[PDB]
Design a protein around this ligand. Structure first.
Ligand code: BEF
Ligand code: BEF
Ligand code: MG
Ligand code: MG
Lengths: 128, 128
């Protein structure tokens, strides 16, 4: 019952309650998690490690997730990214898809069984 | 009511429930938190960033906190460290104090007001 053993997930999210929920879910599935409350902090961290997947919020205090994405994509980083956001802004969702994220999911998350499918697909893809 | 604004705290702890509690406490005090479920993961992360304080567990699955400490101290890292552990092993507590940790606190944590004092003292010391 641990399909994600051996996979490392970076979670970037400013609301501590949701940070805890994602940690609990992905840890229970066997992944080792790294959590960053802040986009600037996540940017610096990515300089020294290579997560298998990053789960990323959009609205965050100091630097939002779209700017985070641009910085790491501009430097050649092709880490798979799943965005989980409350945004309804279609331009901001399009910006993330242009930056090569696998999908953008809307908060609150309700089909946890679906989230599971998509995260596994992100970690063990069949095509590019 | 945010005495830790501007300070970054790394939390290394394998139990997700306690990981969440520390995140909630330190975030509410204004610190930005980075959480690692795993000691090997924390070691790699420290190669690319410089937290103001690390809060560290001892018993963790793959690599315990004492080995983590030795590795980063052996490489010249003098990040302040606070150990929060359930260990009753006096030799293991002594090992951490020999590796230069500021203190070793026993789980479960009950004087949250005291934890606050000691973390601030670690971040804003008066002497060496
Ligand atoms: F703050 Be996020 F965009 F949900
Ligand atoms: F697992 Be720890 F030493 F509390
Ligand atoms: Mg947010
Ligand atoms: Mg432990």
């Amino acid at each position: 019952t641990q399909p994600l053993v051996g996979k490392q997930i970076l979670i970037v999210e400013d609301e501590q309650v949701f940070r805890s929920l994602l940690d609990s879910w992905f840890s229970s599935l066997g992944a080792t998690t790294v959590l960053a409350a802040d986009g600037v902090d996540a940017l610096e961290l990515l300089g020294g490690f290579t997560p298998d997947l990053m789960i990323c919020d959009i609205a965050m205090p100091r630097m939002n997730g779209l700017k985070l994405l641009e910085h790491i994509r501009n430097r050649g980083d092709q880490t798979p990214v799943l965005v989980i956001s409350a945004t309804e802004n279609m331009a901001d969702i399009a910006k993330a898809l242009r930056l090569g994220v696998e999908d953008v999911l809307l908060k609150p998350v309700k089909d946890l069984n679906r989230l599971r499918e998509m995260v596994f697909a992100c970690l063990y893809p069949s095509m590019f």
